Amino acid sequence: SWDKDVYPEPPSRTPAPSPQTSLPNPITYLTKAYDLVVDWPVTLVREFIERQHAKNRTYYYHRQYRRVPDITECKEGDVLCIYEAEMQWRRDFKVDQEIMNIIQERLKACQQREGENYQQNCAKELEQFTKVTKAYQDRYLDLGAYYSARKCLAKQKQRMLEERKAARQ
Amino acid sequence: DGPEKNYEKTLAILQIESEKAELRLKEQEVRRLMRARGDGPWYQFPTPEKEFIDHSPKATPDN
């Protein structure tokens, strides 16, 4: 159900078995027994379940919201468009929270996959995590419990004013 | 029912509350202005009636 575009995974590179010893492998014996006893009835039950699903197949859709006017083009005191912009901002905040969760899972998956080479081969994942956490700290940090579109806009305006003042010299 | 019903109900509630807020602020301003300078219907303090004034000619001509 998941896609490698959003959950990237390098292709596995397993080595071929080269048994120098003449002893039988209990892992291979127990694995073959494990498939023949467990995997076949489980996949039979799941195939019966899946054909019942195909007999009664239903569909659901992912909801999409159009872009309401943002709070910058929105008059103060006129609580209608205040409310619309604020709930759009809250929706985008939740979306950014889940984006952060996605990036954190990517970083954890990289570290577990590389193992002892995580300090070198996870440079791209760590760089992506660092860039996205710098952006998140620029947009949402230190807002408080009553975080809102107005508070985010005030913080962004303060940051832009500081950057403009620092850009004069 | 769905999210749009709650969304538009919230919009209507917010519109009603904002209209009540601006109406209360305006009636504060109206009452303050009218009490400061009574020229409308409210805060009209009484005044003796002209209908109980004698206008007939009297004994003393210099009235």
Side-chain angles (χ1 to χ4, degrees):
Chain A
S1 178
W2 58 286
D3 50 302
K4 276 87 188 161
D5 289 12
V6 302
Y7 305 114
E9 186 148 279
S12 179
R13 310 207 313 143
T14 176
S18 307
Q20 298 163 19
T21 184
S22 88
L23 284 187
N25 207 343
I27 311 168
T28 61
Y29 276 9
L30 271 46
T31 311
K32 289 189 295 181
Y34 170 78
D35 300 272
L36 191 62
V37 175
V38 178
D39 199 3
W40 187 66
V42 160
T43 194
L44 276 179
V45 169
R46 188 52 182 186
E47 273 163 353
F48 166 64
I49 290 170
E50 279 295 322
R51 65 178 64 88
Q52 288 306 312
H53 293 185
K55 270 163 59 162
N56 313 112
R57 168 72 61 204
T58 55
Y59 303 104
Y60 89 100
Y61 311 97
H62 164 83
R63 197 192 280 270
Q64 40 188 357
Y65 300 88
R66 88 190 61 169
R67 297 316 283 186
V68 290
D70 186 10
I71 207 163
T72 64
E73 58 259 23
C74 167
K75 291 188 175 298
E76 54 159 353
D78 186 74
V79 306
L80 280 299
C81 63
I82 297 294
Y83 173 76
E84 274 176 341
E86 280 265 15
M87 314 304 294
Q88 157 154 288
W89 186 92
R90 273 207 84 95
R91 187 179 298 113
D92 300 353
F93 182 80
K94 196 64 183 165
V95 165
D96 284 2
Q97 292 333 289
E98 297 289 341
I99 284 178
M100 266 288 167
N101 294 311
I102 292 295
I103 300 303
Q104 279 162 106
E105 293 179 353
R106 269 188 190 176
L107 193 79
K108 293 180 267 276
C110 185
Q111 209 280 327
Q112 184 67 25
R113 261 188 279 102
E114 299 312 310
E116 321 276 357
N117 299 290
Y118 83 103
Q119 294 179 357
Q120 182 181 13
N121 291 335
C122 284
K124 290 178 68 66
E125 269 95 348
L126 190 50
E127 176 61 40
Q128 193 77 274
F129 181 49
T130 304
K131 278 196 292 187
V132 74
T133 191
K134 180 55 172 48
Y136 188 92
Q137 283 176 354
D138 291 331
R139 65 169 34 197
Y140 289 154
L141 202 60
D142 291 337
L143 285 191
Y146 303 102
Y147 51 87
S148 76
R150 329 171 53 223
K151 276 191 195 58
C152 185
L153 174 60
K155 179 188 160 125
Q156 161 152 340
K157 268 192 183 178
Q158 153 168 324
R159 174 165 35 82
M160 293 177 70
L161 274 170
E162 212 165 3
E163 271 161 19
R164 196 180 71 173
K165 190 176 59 52
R168 301 293 176 88
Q169 47 262 17
Chain B
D1 291 331
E4 55 266 11
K5 172 194 215 184
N6 203 54
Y7 205 88
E8 296 167 342
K9 266 178 54 166
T10 306
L11 284 193
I13 289 157
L14 285 185
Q15 191 209 42
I16 291 165
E17 291 285 345
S18 65
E19 284 187 320
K20 270 147 77 174
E22 54 93 17
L23 278 183
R24 285 176 207 161
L25 293 197
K26 293 182 183 293
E27 64 89 20
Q28 294 297 109
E29 192 73 23
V30 170
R31 293 179 66 188
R32 183 180 63 83
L33 267 166
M34 280 177 84
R35 179 67 180 271
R37 44 174 183 87
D39 48 0
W42 304 340
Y43 298 117
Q44 290 295 284
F45 310 129
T47 292
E49 319 184 1
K50 57 154 61 64
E51 71 176 1
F52 289 111
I53 299 182
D54 206 304
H55 292 101
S56 55
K58 296 164 175 63
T60 300
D62 317 307
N63 295 148

